[PDB]
Amino acid sequence: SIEDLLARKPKDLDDSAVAAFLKDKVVLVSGAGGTIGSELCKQCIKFGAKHLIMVDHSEYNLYKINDDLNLYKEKITPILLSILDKQSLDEVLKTYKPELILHAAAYKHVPLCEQNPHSAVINNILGTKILCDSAKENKVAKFVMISTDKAVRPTNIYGCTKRVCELYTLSMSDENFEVACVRFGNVLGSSGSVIPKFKAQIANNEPLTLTHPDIVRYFMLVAEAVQLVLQAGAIAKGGELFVLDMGKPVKIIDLAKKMLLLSNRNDLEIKITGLRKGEKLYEELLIDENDAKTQYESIFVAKNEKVDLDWLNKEIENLQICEDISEALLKIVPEFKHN
Amino acid sequence: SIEDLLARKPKDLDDSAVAAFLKDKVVLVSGAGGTIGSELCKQCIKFGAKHLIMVDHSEYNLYKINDDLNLYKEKITPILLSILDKQSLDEVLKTYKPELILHAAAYKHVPLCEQNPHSAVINNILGTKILCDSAKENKVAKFVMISTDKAVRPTNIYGCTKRVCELYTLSMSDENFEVACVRFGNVLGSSGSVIPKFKAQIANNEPLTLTHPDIVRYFMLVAEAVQLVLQAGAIAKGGELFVLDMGKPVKIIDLAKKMLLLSNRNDLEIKITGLRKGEKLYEELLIDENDAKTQYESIFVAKNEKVDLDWLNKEIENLQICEDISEALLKIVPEFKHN
Ligand SMILES: NC(=O)c1ccc[n+]([C@@H]2O[C@H](COP(=O)([O-])OP(=O)(O)OC[C@H]3O[C@@H](n4cnc5c(N)ncnc54)[C@H](O)[C@@H]3O)[C@@H](O)[C@H]2O)c1
Ligand SMILES: NC(=O)c1ccc[n+]([C@@H]2O[C@H](COP(=O)([O-])OP(=O)(O)OC[C@H]3O[C@@H](n4cnc5c(N)ncnc54)[C@H](O)[C@@H]3O)[C@@H](O)[C@H]2O)c1
Ligand SMILES: O=c1ccn([C@@H]2O[C@H](COP(=O)(O)OP(=O)(O)O)[C@@H](O)[C@H]2O)c(=O)[nH]1
Ligand SMILES: O=c1ccn([C@@H]2O[C@H](COP(=O)(O)OP(=O)(O)O)[C@@H](O)[C@H]2O)c(=O)[nH]1
Ligand code: NA
Ligand code: NA
Ligand code: NA
Ligand code: NA
Ligand code: NA
Ligand code: NA
C-alpha cells in the first residue's frame, strides 16, 4: 500500500524506554479520539500506563477510541469535554491527578482555519493556554505538546497558532512543570488528509485533484510519529523543542500517480486545482544543521528562547478582542508571513 | 442491504412541499457535519436553499460535509464553532441573518452522557438555550429542533436533556419566532450505532455483541427521517411538538441475525452482554392515540404545554452548578425515572 511505501521505518524506536516513561502513570490525552490522540492512547496502554484519561469534545471520536480499547476498559476513562471549559477541566485534573499530559487537541485544517481565524485562535491558543495553566496549577509533572512543521516561518493562521502554542507552553516550563514540544510533518492517512481524499476520488471514478505539480510534503506513519513523540517526552528535561527526522520529501504528484497505479485506475485524470491561501509548496525542513543531537537519530533539539509570560498573556488577551487577527498574530510571531 | 430491509419507505414524502419551504432561504444547520445534520445540509441544497451556513465544532465532520457539497461551494459557508460560544454565534447570526435554523447539534450516546452528565447538560441544554436565544434575538423566523423517542418518560441523562430542550425551545415560540420540535427514533447506520458496530465485528471475525435477546428499536433511513422533519417544519405554525411514525419495531437479535445471513457469516456467534445503565428494552411508542393527524400520514402532532421561562431559566442556571444533576433534572422533568 502507499502507506507502506512512504513509512519512515525509523531504526531508533525504543519500546523499553517508552515503557519506563509511562509505566504505572496516570496519563491524560487531550484530543484522545483524533488521529494522533487515538494512537497516543493505544501506546499509553501498550507501554504500561495505569490509567488513561481520554479528553475529547467530539462524541463520535471519543466513543470510537473508548470502544477500540474495550479490552482495557478498566484502565480508561472517557471524558467528553472541550478543553476550553476551564472549570470542568480543572475538576477532571483534580479528580484523576495525571502525571503526564499529552496534548493532541487542535484544529488543523489550513483552509478552515483561514476561513475561521477566530475559532482557530480560540481552540488552538486559548485551549492550549487553559489546558497548560490547569496542568501547571494542578502539579502535573510533564506536559508534551504536539506541533507541526507548519509552525516554522508560518504562512497560515493554523501554523501561526501552533507557533504561539509552542511559545506559550515552553515559556511555562520550570523546575516543577516540564514541557516538551515535538514538531513533525504530515501523518500518512490522518483524518481529512490527502490519502483518504484520493481514495474516495478513485472509488467514485473522479479525477484526482492535485493542488500543484511541484508540491511536496514530509510523511510518517502515525505509530512512528507517536512513538518518537513519546521517546522525546521520556528524555525531556523541560523546555525542549524537539524536531523529528521525517526522511525524504514526497512529491504529491508521485503519491497520486502511485495510488492510481496501485488501484489500476490509470483511466483517471489528475487535475491541477491550484495552491490555496496560505499553502506552502515545500514545508520547511525540520532539522537545522545546528540543532542538538539526542541519543535517538530520529530526534533533535531545536533552539528556543522563552518569552515573558506577562507579555504573552497580554497579547493572547488582545487576540480575543482585536479587529485583525492576522495583524495581532504578527505581533507575537514576527516571522509570520501570511499568505 | 440490512438498511434496505429496515427502511420505512414512507408513502408520504413530498419534495415539492419541501422545495416551497426552503427555496431561496438562508438556512443555518447546527451540527452540520453529523449524521442528521449532514443529511439536512444535503436536502437544503437539493430543495433550493440560497445559502447554507454549516455550524459544527468537529473539524473533520465540518471538513467532510463541506467537501461532500463541493459542487455547491458558492452557496455554502463552513463555520467551525461550538454553539456554546454565544459571542461568536451571535456574530454569525448577525452577519448571515438566517431565516431558518435546523438544530441537529447534541451529544447523543446514552452511556457517554451517563458517564459525563455535566457535559451532556452543558452541550445539550445550554447549547440549545444559547442557540435558540440567539436565533430569537436575531429575528430568525423559524427554529426546528431534532428530538428523540428517548425524551418520552426518560430513564437516562441523554433523554432527559433532550426533554428539557423541548420544553425550552417550545416555551420560546411566539408570533414572530416559530419553533417546531420533531421526535423520531433510531436512524439506521448513524454515527457510532449498532449497524456499524456489527459490521466492524463481522469484518474482524468477532462475535456480535447483543445487549439483550428481547431488545427492540424503531428505525428509519436518514433521508426519510430528514425529509419528514423538513415536511414537519414546513407545516409548523409554531409551538408544535411533532412525532414521526417509525412503523414496526425491529428486534435487535433479528437485525444481528440478518446481518450475518447477508454477510454470509453464519460462522459467528451472537453473544449476550447485558443492558446498560438507563437503557430501555423498548422505547416508548411515539404516536399517542390522541395525537392530532396532519396531511402526512407519517407525521402527528403531540400535546405540549409551555412552561414559565423565568422558572426554567433559573433551573437551567442551577443545572450548571449543582452537584446532583440527576436529582435536579427530575425537578424539571417530573416523569424522569433515572435507571
Ligand atoms: N495529522 C497531521 O498530519 C499532523 C502532523 C503534525 C502535527 N499535527 C498536530 O497533531 C494534533 C492532532 O492532529 P490530528 O491529525 O490527530 O487531528 P484530529 O482532528 O484527527 O484530532 C484532534 C482531536 O482533538 C479533538 N479536539 C479538537 N479541539 C478540541 C477541544 N477544544 N477540546 C477537546 N478535544 C478537541 C478533536 O475532536 C479530535 O478528536 C493537532 O495538534 C495537530 O495540530 C498533526
Ligand atoms: N442518530 C439517531 O438515531 C437519532 C435519532 C433521533 C434523534 N437524534 C438526534 O439527532 C441529532 C444528531 O444526532 P446524530 O446521529 O446526527 O449525531 P452526530 O454526533 O453524528 O451529529 C451531531 C453533530 O453535532 C455536532 N455538535 C455537537 N455538539 C456541538 C456544539 N456544541 N457545537 C457545534 N456542533 C456540535 C457534532 O460534532 C456532530 O457533527 C441529535 O440532536 C440527536 O440527539 C438522533
Ligand atoms: O485534494 C487534495 C488535498 C491535498 N493536496 C495536497 O496534498 C498535501 C497534503 O495535504 P493534506 O490536506 O493531507 O495535509 P496538509 O499538508 O495541508 O496538513 C498538500 O500538499 C496538499 O496541497 C492535494 O494535492 N489535493
Ligand atoms: O453493541 C451493541 C450496540 C447496541 N446494541 C443495541 O442496539 C440498539 C441500538 O443501539 P444504538 O447504540 O445504535 O442506538 P441507541 O438506541 O442507544 O440510540 C439498542 O437496543 C442497543 O442495546 C447492541 O445490541 N449491541
Ligand atoms: Na530498548
Ligand atoms: Na483508527
Ligand atoms: Na472505562
Ligand atoms: Na408534492
Ligand atoms: Na456520509
Ligand atoms: Na463555500
**Cα angle A105-A106-A108, degrees, rounded to a multiple of 5:** 135
Select the residue of A57, A88, A109 nearest B57 (Cβ to Cβ).
A57
Q: Is the CB of residue B110 less than 8 Å from the CB of residue B150? A: yes
C-alpha closest to that of B204 among B265, B272, B271: B265
Other C-beta atoms closer than 10 Å to the C-beta of A194 total: 22
Q: Is the CB of residue B219 less than 8 Å from the CB of residue B128? A: no
User: Which 3 state secondary structure label does DSSP give A316?
Assistant: helix
Ligand 4 atom with the shortest distance to the CA of B283:
16
Contact B59 A120 (CB under 8 A): no
Residues of A with CB under 8 A from a CB of B: 57-64, 66-67, 77-82, 84-85, 88, 107-109, 112-113, 115-116, 118-120, 122-123, 191-192, 197
B301 forms bridges with which residues in the sheet?
B242, B292
Q: What are phi and psi of B39, to 5 degrees?
A: -70, -40
All three cell numbers of A129: 493556554
When computed from its CA atoms, the radius of gyration of chain A, rounded to whole angstroms, is 20
Q: What are phi and psi of A54, to 5 degrees?
A: -100, 110
C-alpha closest to that of A293 among A12, A67, A14: A12
Q: Is the CB of residue A172 less than 8 Å from the CB of residue A136? A: yes
- CA-nearest residue for atom 23, ligand 3, is A210
- All residues at 6 or more sequence positions from A239 whose CB lies less than 8 Å from its CB, including other chains: A170, A173, A178, A179, A304, A306
d(C-alpha B219, C-alpha B251), whole Å: 11
**Cα angle B176-B144-A62, degrees, rounded to a multiple of 5:** 140
Distance of CA A181 to the CA centre of its chain: 10
Of the options 3.40.190.10, 3.40.50.720, 3.40.718.10, 2.70.170.10, the CATH number for the domain spanning B2-252+279-332: 3.40.50.720
Q: Is the CB of residue A247 less than 8 Å from the CB of residue A58? A: no
Sole residue written with cell 514545508: A283
Which H helix or E strand runs over A134?
A: helix A127-137
- CA-nearest residue for atom 30, ligand 2, is B82
Sole residue written with cell 503519491: A255
Which H helix or E strand runs over A148?
A: strand A142-148
- CA-nearest residue for atom 37, ligand 2, is B58
d(C-alpha B243, C-alpha B222), whole Å: 15
- CA-nearest residue for atom 32, ligand 1, is A82
Q: What is the CATH number assigned to the segment(s) A2-332?
A: 3.40.50.720
- A304 annotated to bind ligand: no
- Using an 8 Å CB-CB cutoff, list chain B residues near A109: 59, 63
Measured CA to CA in angstroms, residue B305 lies from A289, B169, B172 at distances of: 72, 12, 12
Ligand 8 mean position, distance from CA B176 (Å): 27
- All residues at 6 or more sequence positions from B52 whose CB lies less than 8 Å from its CB, including other chains: B27, B28, B29, B41, B44, B45, B69, B72, B75, B76, B77
One-letter-per-residue 3-state SS of chain B: CHHHHHCCCCCCCCHHHHHHHHCCCEEEEECCCCHHHHHHHHHHHHCCCCEEEEEECCHHHHHHHHHHCHHHHHHEEEEECCCCCHHHHHHHHHHHCCCEEEECCCCCCHHHHHHCHHHHHHHHHHHHHHHHHHHHHCCCCEEEEEEEHHHCCCCCHHHHHHHHHHHHHHHHCCCCCEEEEEEECEECCCCCCHHHHHHHHHHCCCCEEECCCCCEECEECHHHHHHHHHHHHHHCCCCEEEEECCCCCEEHHHHHHHHHHHCCCCCCCEEECCCCCCCCCECCCCCCCCCEECCCCCEEEECCCCCCHHHHHHHHHHHHHCCCHHHHHHHHCCCCCCC
User: Could you give the count of Cα atoms lying within 13 Å of A100 in the half-sphere of its Cβ?
Assistant: 23
User: Which 3 state secondary structure label does DSSP give A187?
Assistant: strand
DSSP character at residue A282: B
Beta strands in A149-214 (DSSP E): 178-184, 186-187, 208-210
Contact B81 A119 (CB under 8 A): yes
Distance of CA B327 to the CA centre of its chain: 24
Which one of the listed residues A129, A142, A150, A280 is annotated catalytic? A150
Q: Is the CB of residue A278 less than 8 Å from the CB of residue A338? A: yes
| A121 burial type by CB count under 10 A (0-12 exposed, 13-18 middle, 19+ buried) | buried
Pocket test for ligand 2, best of B29, B107, B108, B169 (most atoms within 8 A of CB): B108
- Using an 8 Å CB-CB cutoff, list chain B residues near A63: 109, 112, 192
Active site residue A46: no
Sole residue written with cell 445487549: B211
- All residues at 6 or more sequence positions from A94 whose CB lies less than 8 Å from its CB, including other chains: A138
d(C-alpha B148, C-alpha A262), whole Å: 45
Give residue numbers after which chain B breaks (C–N above 2.5 Å). none
d(C-alpha A334, C-alpha B2), whole Å: 57
All three cell numbers of A115: 476561513
Select the residue of A79, A82, A120 nearest B82 (Cβ to Cβ).
A82
d(C-alpha B29, C-alpha A158), whole Å: 25
Which H helix or E strand runs over A289?
A: none
Strand order from edge to edge, sheet including A51-56: A76-80, A51-56, A26-30, A100-103, A142-148, A178-184, A240-244, A299-302, A292-293
- All residues at 6 or more sequence positions from A289 whose CB lies less than 8 Å from its CB, including other chains: none
B27 forms bridges with which residues in the sheet?
B52, B100
Ligand 10 mean position, distance from CA B56 (Å): 15
DSSP character at residue A144: E
**Experimental approach taken:** X-ray
A296 forms bridges with which residues in the sheet?
none
Measured CA to CA in angstroms, residue A214 lies from A141, A255, B205 at distances of: 44, 12, 43
Q: Is the CB of residue B76 less than 8 Å from the CB of residue B125? A: no
d(C-alpha A5, C-alpha B109), whole Å: 38
Sole residue written with cell 491541477: A272
d(C-alpha A281, C-alpha A213), whole Å: 10
DSSP character at residue A123: I
d(C-alpha A40, C-alpha A135), whole Å: 18
d(C-alpha B86, C-alpha B106), whole Å: 16
**B5, B10, B11, B12 alpha-carbon torsion, rounded to 10°:** -170
d(C-alpha B197, C-alpha B30), whole Å: 26
DSSP character at residue A125: I
d(C-alpha B158, C-alpha A38), whole Å: 25
d(C-alpha B324, C-alpha B295), whole Å: 44
C-alpha closest to that of B33 among B73, B78, B70, B89: B78
Ligand 1 atom with the shortest distance to the CA of A149:
6
d(C-alpha B58, C-alpha B38), whole Å: 12
| B73 burial type by CB count under 10 A (0-12 exposed, 13-18 middle, 19+ buried) | exposed
Q: Is the CB of residue B70 less than 8 Å from the CB of residue B111? A: no
- Using an 8 Å CB-CB cutoff, list chain A residues near B63: 109, 112, 192
- All residues at 6 or more sequence positions from A277 whose CB lies less than 8 Å from its CB, including other chains: A111, A114, A156, A339
Helix axes A15-22, A35-46, angle to 10 degrees: 90
Shortest distance, CA B297 to any CA of chain A (angstroms): 33
Q: Is the CB of residue A244 less than 8 Å from the CB of residue A182? A: yes
- Resolution in angstroms comes to 1.6
Ligand 1 atom with the shortest distance to the CA of A33:
39
